[PDB]
Amino acid sequence: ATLKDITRRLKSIKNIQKITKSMKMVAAAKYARAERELKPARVYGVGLIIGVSSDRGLCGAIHSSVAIIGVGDKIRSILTFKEVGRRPPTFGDASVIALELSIIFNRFRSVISYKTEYSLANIIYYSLKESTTSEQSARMTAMDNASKNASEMIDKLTLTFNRTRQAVITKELIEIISGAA
Amino acid sequence: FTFASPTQVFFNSANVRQVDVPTQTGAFGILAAHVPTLQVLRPGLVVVHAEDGTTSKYFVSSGSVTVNADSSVQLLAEEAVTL
């Protein structure tokens, strides 16, 4: 209720809003990298329950949509392969998955819409390349929505700040008038 | 004829004369009219004979070559670099 508490809260949510908006452009730049490398990957991979995701969250309804194996640490989090999403998925990563050992992943369409021997590793590589392109663009929107929610939150607190600022001025003024009279 | 690594794509659905290919048992030169077979590769060179008579030389470490019932071949390696 105090100006100090509102000033602190404003800076607190502004910090969140700046970070979420900073990750909207990151997930826009990483998605551009992921789609550039998906074209040669789609022409490469053409010819048991496997769940493909990542360790990195904050990407909306991607980990929840996909419903020993299991690539992506966030898929074992409900009931294993770890350390994916931080860096783009290489063929070597798809090889290790095949080395340790009918497949579920998110297929890239655009920025809004999605759907949920040597040849076996190629399918794992195809899923990995498709998953990270899906993961990044969904994160682009997730942090865009979060940057909208934080901005609406700032707007409501700014109106409170202005009411409290006016309230303090009047209170100081009455204490002076009364002290004089 | 399709030739691609995970990194880059060299040929996209040719339209080519013949391709020399390294295979676990020696080597196979796939002509336009070749029997439908599925083969696995070994460390060796790939020689691509272009339709205008010219030549293309790349190297292959490992992968697979697939020639279907029709006149279509898909060659794919783990790495292919020049030179």
Partner: peptide, 23 residues
């Protein structure tokens, strides 16, 4: 397996992230 063979050929030709979790 051919995968183990394929990756060994990959290491030699380059001369010119995921971690294992087991319960």
């Amino acid at each position: 397996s051919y995968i183990r063979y394929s990756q060994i050929c990959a290491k030699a030709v380059r001369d010119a992230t995921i971690k294992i979790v087991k319960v």
